Amino acid sequence: KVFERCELARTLKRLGMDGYRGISLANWMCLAKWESGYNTRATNYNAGDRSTDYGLFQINSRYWCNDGKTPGAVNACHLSCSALLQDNIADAVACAKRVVRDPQGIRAWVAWRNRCQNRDVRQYVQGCGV
C-alpha cells in the first residue's frame, strides 16, 4: 500500500508514535518518506552484505527481522520480515519502536541524518490535523 501523507500521519499518531522515545511525529514522517516513499511493500536488497531492507521504514534483516537468508542475523523484533510487508502497519510500527529503544534512537537510519536531521520537518505533518 502507498499511503497518502496525511492518512499516514493520522495512522502513526493513533499507533502512539508522536513523541515515542523523544521522537516527534514529523520526524517519523520524514523517515518514512525518504525510506520508502510511504510504500509498505518496498524492499531493497543490499548486495554488499546480503541483507534486505523491508517496508515502510526499511527495517534491516540483519538485526530486526528474520528472512532466513541473511548471514549472522538476529531477529530483535521477533518477527518474520514478511510481517513488515503488510498493508496493516501495526507490526512495522512495533518494530520501529524497538529499533529506537537502542542508544542510537532515530539516528539508526542514515537517511534520517541526511534528509531530516536539523531541518524544518513541519512540512510533513502540515494540514493533517494531528
Swiss-Prot record:
The lineage of its organism: Eukaryota, Metazoa, Chordata, Craniata, Vertebrata. PANTHER family: LYSOZYME C. GO terms for molecular function: identical protein binding; lysozyme activity. Pfam families: Lys. Lysozyme C is capable of both hydrolysis and transglycosylation; it also shows a slight esterase activity. It acts rapidly on both peptide-substituted and unsubstituted peptidoglycan, and slowly on chitin oligosaccharides. It catalyses: Hydrolysis of (1->4)-beta-linkages between N-acetylmuramic acid and N-acetyl-D-glucosamine residues in a peptidoglycan and between N-acetyl-D-glucosamine residues in chitodextrins. This is Lysozyme C. It is an enzyme of class 3 (hydrolase). One of its GO terms (biological process) is antimicrobial humoral response. It comes from Homo sapiens (Human). InterPro entries: Glyco_hydro_22, Glyco_hydro_22_CS, Glyco_hydro_22_lys, Lysozyme-like_dom_sf. Monomer.
